Amino acid sequence: LLNLGHDPLADRGQKGTAKPLQPSAPRNKTRVVSYRVPHNAAVQVYDYRAKRARVVFGPELVTLDPEEQFTVLSLSAGRPKRPHARRALCLLLGPDFFTDVITIETADHARLQLQLAYNWHFELKNRNDPAEAAKLFSVPDFVGDACKAIASRVRGAVASVTFDDFHKNSARIIRMAVFGFEMSEDTGPDGTLLPKARDQAVFPQNGLVVSSVDVQSVEPVDQRTRDALQRSVQLAIEITTN
Amino acid sequence: LLNLGHDPLADRGQKGTAKPLQPSAPRNKTRVVSYRVPHNAAVQVYDYRAKRARVVFGPELVTLDPEEQFTVLSLSAGRPKRPHARRALCLLLGPDFFTDVITIETADHARLQLQLAYNWHFELKNRNDPAEAAKLFSVPDFVGDACKAIASRVRGAVASVTFDDFHKNSARIIRMAVFGFEMSEDTGPDGTLL
Question: Is B183–A211 a contact, with Cβ atoms under 8 angstroms apart?
């Protein structure tokens, strides 16, 4: 039915039990229903197009799972899915998990398949207020470990690769002091933030603009500079001996 | 019907329930309706041409989704969509999400597909007052993380690429002190800015 054009989703029961109903679905508008009290404490929350967080806990059990099998991912043809990219894109849209290149896990989300080299960025906005009151990211430490995946990633995405490139360059010529000032990141509110980017220190305050950029190293003088620094230590030892 | 020329949008119900109605649509003029109280608390807001923010929250649930499947994007032939560009252009016009090159996420919006090298600029004007009173960008921190995507982008779009070009130039000749003064940005009101 998903591929047919209109997803209705019906399902009867063994004893001729009738469970199919009708949601508001001109194209998309979810499918929710929550029965409680002496009857059948069961809430069936169903989302369309994507796979929104279906938080639902019952007696002695708690379910909050995106869940989809690699076969379903395939069956999602009439949905957003075809080659590799679309598969992954379908994941972070609904399900998750697919270690390809860079990854970012945060706020009950997971980002997969994106080559850092291909100037790829990742982001995952937080959940909602009712989700927090429910549990969400349980405890800070819990979030720490879950987020640790990003720290290891960044170290394996840029911090390591670049080191090898520096080696390639130094295997030809190169000059390098610029790997001794800063690299930083950003901090600050909209319209008044600090978007630092390598040797580009800017900070447009609420009513003031701060900026700074510097220049260093040049093959012949870089070595000569380093040599100078190491020589001063010699003189120090010399006067120390006397 | 979208391709046929006039989008009416009808849909009956299993038990012969009648749900199709008629909006004001000479070409475009939306389709809104909000039923409440002991009857059927359901408001169906439908936009035409583009995919405006359909904010709508009900008992125990809240929906505010552009939502469109890659198949719908394709079906949007009689709408604004054909090759790659138009697809992306159709996205930021209605739906969203498509990491191509530069990206800017802000005020419940998303900008996709635009090569910085091709002197491409991105922009996304804020929402409306009633949207704020509803929730909008919930809390500042929330907006920070959502916007962090831009910081990483700019660093990967210009801050990194240029560094390599400087290397290419320095591999021939070059002189370079100009990478030690400033680069800045703008600040100020119209007709009196910096």
Answer: yes
In whole angstroms, what is the distance from residue A11 CA to residue A1 CA?
13
Please give the C-alpha separations between residue B70 and each of A40, A83, B10, B99, in angstroms, as whole numbers: 37, 12, 23, 14
Q: At A192, is the secondary structure helix, strand, or coil?
A: coil
- H/E element holding B125? none
CA B123 from centre of chain: 10
CA–CA distance, B18 with A135 (Å, rounded to integer): 41
Resolution to 1 decimal place, in Å: 9.0
Contacts of A169 in chain B (CB under 8 A): 167
Cβ contacts of residue A164 below 8 Å, gap of 6+? none
With a CB-CB cutoff of 8 Å, which residues 43-72 of chain B face chain A?
Answer: 44, 46, 60-63, 65, 67-72
DSSP B60: T
- A170 CB within 8 Å of a chain B CB: no
From CA A66, how far away is CA A95, in angstroms rounded?
5
B155 contacts in chain A (CB < 8 Å): 197-198
CB contact at 8 A, B52 and A64: no
Cα A12 to Cα A18: distance, rounded to the nearest angstrom: 5
Token digits for A82? 């075809």
CA proximity to A51, closest of A102, A91, A22? A91
**Residues B144, B149, B150: CA angle, nearest 5 degrees:** 95
Q: CA-CA distance, A148 to A157, in Å (whole number)?
A: 14
CB-CB contact of B109 with B92 (8 Å) = yes
Q: How far apart are CA A117 and CA A97, in angstroms?
A: 21
Question: How far, in Å, CA of A150 to CA of A102, rounded?
Answer: 8
What is the spatial distance between Cα B71 and Cα B136, in angstroms, rounded to a whole number?
Answer: 29
> With an 8 Å Cβ cutoff, are A29 and B63 in contact?
yes
How far apart CA A52 and CA A34 sit, in angstroms, is: 17
- A127 interaction partners in chain B (CB closer than 8 Å): none
Q: Which residues contact B89 (CB under 8 A, 6 or more apart)?
A: B80, B113
CA geometry: angle A105, A108, A112, nearest 5 deg: 40
Residue A189, phi then psi, degrees to nearest 5: -70, 165
Based on C-alpha coordinates, what's the Rg of chain A?
Answer: 28
List C-alpha distances in Å: A186 to A99, B7, B69, B109. 27, 46, 34, 21
- Tell me how the structure was determined: X-ray
